[PDB]
Design an enzyme around this catalytic site. Structure first.
Site, PDB file in Angstrom:
ATOM      1  N   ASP A  25      39.312 -99.254  32.887  1.00  0.00           N
ATOM      2  CA  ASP A  25      38.375 -98.129  32.938  1.00  0.00           C
ATOM      3  C   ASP A  25      38.803 -97.100  33.985  1.00  0.00           C
ATOM      4  O   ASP A  25      38.520 -97.255  35.173  1.00  0.00           O
ATOM      5  CB  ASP A  25      36.960 -98.631  33.211  1.00  0.00           C
ATOM      6  CG  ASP A  25      35.927 -97.559  33.024  1.00  0.00           C
ATOM      7  OD1 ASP A  25      36.327 -96.388  32.814  1.00  0.00           O
ATOM      8  OD2 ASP A  25      34.724 -97.884  33.061  1.00  0.00           O
ATOM      9  N   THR A  26      39.435 -96.013  33.532  1.00  0.00           N
ATOM     10  CA  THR A  26      39.789 -94.900  34.401  1.00  0.00           C
ATOM     11  C   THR A  26      38.587 -94.158  34.961  1.00  0.00           C
ATOM     12  O   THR A  26      38.756 -93.376  35.906  1.00  0.00           O
ATOM     13  CB  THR A  26      40.670 -93.892  33.661  1.00  0.00           C
ATOM     14  OG1 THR A  26      39.945 -93.307  32.570  1.00  0.00           O
ATOM     15  CG2 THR A  26      41.919 -94.575  33.137  1.00  0.00           C
ATOM     16  N   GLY A  27      37.391 -94.363  34.410  1.00  0.00           N
ATOM     17  CA  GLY A  27      36.211 -93.700  34.915  1.00  0.00           C
ATOM     18  C   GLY A  27      35.496 -94.412  36.040  1.00  0.00           C
ATOM     19  O   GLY A  27      34.497 -93.892  36.541  1.00  0.00           O
TER      20      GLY A  27
HETATM   21  C1  LIG Z   1      31.763 -91.582  35.949  1.00  0.00           C
HETATM   22  C2  LIG Z   1      30.371 -92.196  36.210  1.00  0.00           C
HETATM   23  C3  LIG Z   1      30.134 -93.456  35.320  1.00  0.00           C
HETATM   24  C4  LIG Z   1      30.034 -93.125  33.809  1.00  0.00           C
HETATM   25  C5  LIG Z   1      28.988 -92.037  33.537  1.00  0.00           C
HETATM   26  C6  LIG Z   1      31.299 -94.487  35.579  1.00  0.00           C
HETATM   27  N1  LIG Z   1      31.141 -95.778  34.805  1.00  0.00           N
HETATM   28  C7  LIG Z   1      32.382 -96.303  34.113  1.00  0.00           C
HETATM   29  C8  LIG Z   1      32.315 -95.864  32.631  1.00  0.00           C
HETATM   30  O1  LIG Z   1      33.543 -96.124  32.075  1.00  0.00           O
HETATM   31  C9  LIG Z   1      31.218 -96.650  31.902  1.00  0.00           C
HETATM   32  C10 LIG Z   1      31.603 -98.131  31.802  1.00  0.00           C
HETATM   33  C11 LIG Z   1      30.559 -98.881  30.945  1.00  0.00           C
HETATM   34  C12 LIG Z   1      29.209 -99.242  31.551  1.00  0.00           C
HETATM   35  C13 LIG Z   1      28.168 -99.972  30.706  1.00  0.00           C
HETATM   36  C14 LIG Z   1      28.491-100.356  29.266  1.00  0.00           C
HETATM   37  C15 LIG Z   1      29.844-100.001  28.667  1.00  0.00           C
HETATM   38  C16 LIG Z   1      30.888 -99.266  29.506  1.00  0.00           C
HETATM   39  N2  LIG Z   1      31.128 -96.111  30.566  1.00  0.00           N
HETATM   40  C17 LIG Z   1      29.919 -95.436  30.093  1.00  0.00           C
HETATM   41  O2  LIG Z   1      28.937 -95.317  30.769  1.00  0.00           O
HETATM   42  O3  LIG Z   1      30.068 -94.967  28.760  1.00  0.00           O
HETATM   43  C18 LIG Z   1      28.886 -94.362  28.064  1.00  0.00           C
HETATM   44  C19 LIG Z   1      29.281 -93.346  27.524  1.00  0.00           C
HETATM   45  O4  LIG Z   1      30.061 -93.876  26.315  1.00  0.00           O
HETATM   46  C20 LIG Z   1      29.310 -95.113  25.939  1.00  0.00           C
HETATM   47  O5  LIG Z   1      30.368 -96.356  25.823  1.00  0.00           O
HETATM   48  C21 LIG Z   1      30.133 -97.181  26.797  1.00  0.00           C
HETATM   49  C22 LIG Z   1      28.724 -96.901  27.273  1.00  0.00           C
HETATM   50  C23 LIG Z   1      28.497 -95.382  26.861  1.00  0.00           C
HETATM   51  S1  LIG Z   1      30.058 -97.030  35.408  1.00  0.00           S
HETATM   52  O6  LIG Z   1      30.251 -98.281  34.660  1.00  0.00           O
HETATM   53  O7  LIG Z   1      28.660 -96.583  35.308  1.00  0.00           O
HETATM   54  C24 LIG Z   1      30.572 -97.148  37.148  1.00  0.00           C
HETATM   55  C25 LIG Z   1      29.771 -96.306  38.116  1.00  0.00           C
HETATM   56  C26 LIG Z   1      30.187 -96.302  39.570  1.00  0.00           C
HETATM   57  C27 LIG Z   1      31.371 -97.161  39.965  1.00  0.00           C
HETATM   58  C28 LIG Z   1      31.832 -97.153  41.408  1.00  0.00           C
HETATM   59  O8  LIG Z   1      33.050 -97.782  41.458  1.00  0.00           O
HETATM   60  C29 LIG Z   1      32.121 -95.680  41.715  1.00  0.00           C
HETATM   61  O9  LIG Z   1      32.830 -95.083  40.639  1.00  0.00           O
HETATM   62  C30 LIG Z   1      32.181 -97.987  38.972  1.00  0.00           C
HETATM   63  C31 LIG Z   1      31.772 -97.981  37.507  1.00  0.00           C
END
Ligand SMILES: CCC(CC)CN(C[C@@H](O)[C@H](Cc1ccccc1)NC(=O)O[C@H]1CO[C@H]2OCC[C@H]21)S(=O)(=O)c1ccc([C@@H](O)CO)cc1
Lengths: 99, 99
Positions: A25-27
């Site tokens: 996860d690059t996000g």
């Molecule tokens: C950039 C801010 C957020 C995203 C808004 C970053 N997140 C990563 C992101 O990849 C998240 C991963 C995910 C979470 C739950 C279920 C499935 C995938 N994907 C996500 O929410 O996707 C949405 C949109 O598409 C749909 O598919 C999947 C869900 C829908 S996080 O998990 O909340 C997080 C927050 C803070 C930190 C600390 O380390 C500081 O960064 C680490 C990780």
């Protein structure tokens, strides 16, 4: 290897003597793993995303193997619905985005 | 380009004729942008993340250019903490993970 993004980029990881599936996860700044009972000291932390914040336990210097590539760094443990490999460890295995 | 992950993979996007910064997020299925005005019809939808579910407006078949690459797909607008580009558009610009 090269991973396309037609589907979720799930890979097998090894942590605390257990194999798990996790997103590359690059996000995510840090790595967040589903509830597991790791030994050692930890620090409380809160991390925010879509829907709001969750409470996690920050463990430091944890060894994780991702697709046979070894890494060591911080892992946050808490009630996440998915195991998330973040940039803190993705950099250690040489992972890049390419287009 | 090749993008390393020591820093957040933030890029400039163009949508609705406006430039914005957005995070390339391989852990997101979908693309979610912060509150903004977009032309065309939309439908109310829900999306869940690490912290729970939020209400978003779903805009389909939207033109969006990401770091010089064009995509046309679904864009969800709502109270996301950060503008994220998810896999529905990352695939269109030919983005892969490599290590
Ligand atoms: C950039 C801010 C957020 C995203 C808004 C970053 N997140 C990563 C992101 O990849 C998240 C991963 C995910 C979470 C739950 C279920 C499935 C995938 N994907 C996500 O929410 O996707 C949405 C949109 O598409 C749909 O598919 C999947 C869900 C829908 S996080 O998990 O909340 C997080 C927050 C803070 C930190 C600390 O380390 C500081 O960064 C680490 C990780």
């Amino acid at each position: 290897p090269q991973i396309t993004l037609w589907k979720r980029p799930l890979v097998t990881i090894k942590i605390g003597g257990q194999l798990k599936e996790a997103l590359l996860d690059t996000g995510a700044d840090d790595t967040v793993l589903e509830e597991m009972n790791l030994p050692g000291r930890w620090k409380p932390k809160m991390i925010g995303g879509i829907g709001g914040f969750i409470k996690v336990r920050q463990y430091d210097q944890i060894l994780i193997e991702i697709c046979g590539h070894k890494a060591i760094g911080t892992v946050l443990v808490g009630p996440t619905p998915v195991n998330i490999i973040g940039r803190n460890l993705l950099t250690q295995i040489g992972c890049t985005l390419n287009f």
